[PDB]
Symmetry: C3
Subunit: 275 residues, 3 copies
């Protein structure tokens, strides 16, 4: 369970479909789009050719943060990288390992907790596409990265989580001891503060400290604005046990209005104390 | 005052929740001595703390902590039936661990940090009314070896107030040039803020100070923060700048204009503050 | 090309605050050449800078610096009798120090980094008025061995504007592929922002670049910020992504929609910009 060195040329098909009640979403199979979009994982140095079809009645696009891409895979109307209704296009994202340039300076790699979103619906910033659900997660791993038993994606989109109605979660389950991975993405108009009862993480790339020499901060509350993305890995219930562990936006009115879910950590027998 | 020692001590303490004056509420180590911010709790990594907690109010209350290990019974939440009815008592158990290598070879991150506690049931099940009335306080958790300060001041940007004070009433904080002052900065409520100090800068890491010439941590003097963010640092009062009334404030302009200002009065050894009229 | 040298030079400069067209205000090194942002001040750790200051306006003005070392008399505040009357002159001194180990064993953080200066007395004692009008400038303090860039651009999100500009006027900035471009990014006013660059990313640390494989700083391309935050980075133009009109915007959706967008214009070595067809 560690991430290998990348350098595969991988391929996938992505569709932008309309969903029930105003929503739109990406998906890897027509008829099966989802909010948030399907998780895309790659290893540093991979290349991904995304074979896109807009199946809707309005232009759409696909725009990625942090990964490498030429101006033709930008995903913006300004560059004519959008997709007409019914249209088709192939976006290419690349990645690079870190290393030294000819300069002798250090080039950082592509690894990170990133995301992809529309950039053309509603306005030329994607405002109404993001709002409708056109977003999702991409993880790019470094060699030797520790792999999880599970990855869950939490998006604070304006005043919702993953576009869901108020006080509907989502909830996620695990078993005590599971290495659980969280991808956290924020979108829209408002700043937020992500809080987890019972668990904490480092505020670096991996969410876990390099070792005793790692100056990274350890936190359980993280301010995030539109298009911030971060992620971490927590041992489920470490030092605290099983339970319905609340996670929420800690802005008080935001938590009060619905931006809450449960991290249901289970005992080996499958039962949750108090739930 | 030296360096933080290794932890491991089981500690115990009594805590109450008292209505204060002006529709406020607060936390106290003794009855009739609730404060806003609540009493400063310091453990070292390893220590356990048993808070014999009692509610002296006519409405339920709770105690919820950030950053420290605790079981679900001391969650502080109506969902986990861990609140304290009017007139009730409860023992909240917090614990802390050291950092260490896991079985799988990964680094478990310590309990140390600048943390905080607050209510979770007054007003709404997130504790909005309780946080608003003053039911919050600081928790410092040291790691073995941490430099310890000459003094410690807690600054809580609560919505549009510092420590639930009225506009433009600071609070002010005194020190003397050369002192090692530790600031604990917590934020609560609805608004983002940006915390700024005149004359003084710190490292945006755990301890607010740099490991050494290899610590890559950012050296800031302005720091955005949102509800339930908690950080702190230590500075040398007047270092490289000398004595005087050194402003701190929220750098959100309308917040500084509408009261989120205070002075960090840095005295000469003789006790006087250049340029400043008490 | 180059490297920051060690500091230690005393330097001097003239500064003028002047009214500009349309109730605006800005700073300048020469009279009549006032800009928004104000002129870029650059120093190396150790340097002292005396700034011969001229208030050409009819309204008092002040000069207030983040991050650097100054005594209360260069505080630039009404509080510390530190503002410049209409038609007044005044020398403001800024000092900077190298990082060094203190006599008490701790590490003292240096002055280096991406800082700024701004007015503190116009409109309010927070300088809310003069900051809105455009009285704010960038300050860069260099650590010895820092990589010096081919070009430096300053990007101030001032409330809902970029450099006080009208909506949807950039600024746009040009580079050639492979050029070492240093962004200075400041925020002011009332609102939080998220700064985003297409096709480019940087280290969230002091220099925006990682020092080596054991630098644990995050690699981001979207940075949240608020009034008086300042940061910076150097990127290699088009590295791994090539030439093009690379959009930089605030990613708060209503903020880019309403004009907070500009272009990073990266040219091929033949000077062309594929796709650019405004
Ligand atoms: Cu964009
Ligand atoms: Cu929120
Ligand atoms: Cu909590
Ligand atoms: Cu984006
Ligand atoms: Cu909570
Ligand atoms: Cu504020
Ligand atoms: Cu200042
Ligand atoms: Cu909390
Ligand atoms: Cu100020
Ligand atoms: Cu903005
Ligand atoms: Cu982008
Ligand atoms: Cu300032």
């Amino acid at each position: 369970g560690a991430a290998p060195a990348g350098g595969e040329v991988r391929r996938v098909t992505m569709y932008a479909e309309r969903l029930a009640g105003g929503q739109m979403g990406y998906g890897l199979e027509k008829g099966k789009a989802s909010i948030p979009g399907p998780l895309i994982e790659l290893n540093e140095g991979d290349t991904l050719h995304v074979e896109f079809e807009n199946t809707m009645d309005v232009p759409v696009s696909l725009h990625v943060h942090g990964l490498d891409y030429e101006i033709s895979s930008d995903g913006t109307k300004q560059n004519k990288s959008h997709v007409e209704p019914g249209g088709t296009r192939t976006y290419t994202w690349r990645t690079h390992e870190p290393g030294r340039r000819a300069d002798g300076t250090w080039r950082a790699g592509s690894a990170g907790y990133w995301h992809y979103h529309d950039h053309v619906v509603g306005t030329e910033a994607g405002t109404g596409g993001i709002r409708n659900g056109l977003y999702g997660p991409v993880i790019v791993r470094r060699k030797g990265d520790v792999l999880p038993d599970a990855t869950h994606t939490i998006v604070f989109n304006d005043m919702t989580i993953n576009n869901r109605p108020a006080h509907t979660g989502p909830n996620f389950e695990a078993t005590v001891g599971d290495r659980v991975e969280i991808v956290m993405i924020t979108h829209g108009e408002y700043y937020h503060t992500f809080h987890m009862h019972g668990h904490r993480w480092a505020d670096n790339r991996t969410g876990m400290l390099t070792g005793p020499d790692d100056p990274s901060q350890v936190i359980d509350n993280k301010i995030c604005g539109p298009a911030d993305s971060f992620g971490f890995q927590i041992i489920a219930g470490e030092g605290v046990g099983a339970g319905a562990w609340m996670y929420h936006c800690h802005v008080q009115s935001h938590s009060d209005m619905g931006m809450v879910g449960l991290f249901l950590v289970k005992k080996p027998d499958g039962t949750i104390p108090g739930y």
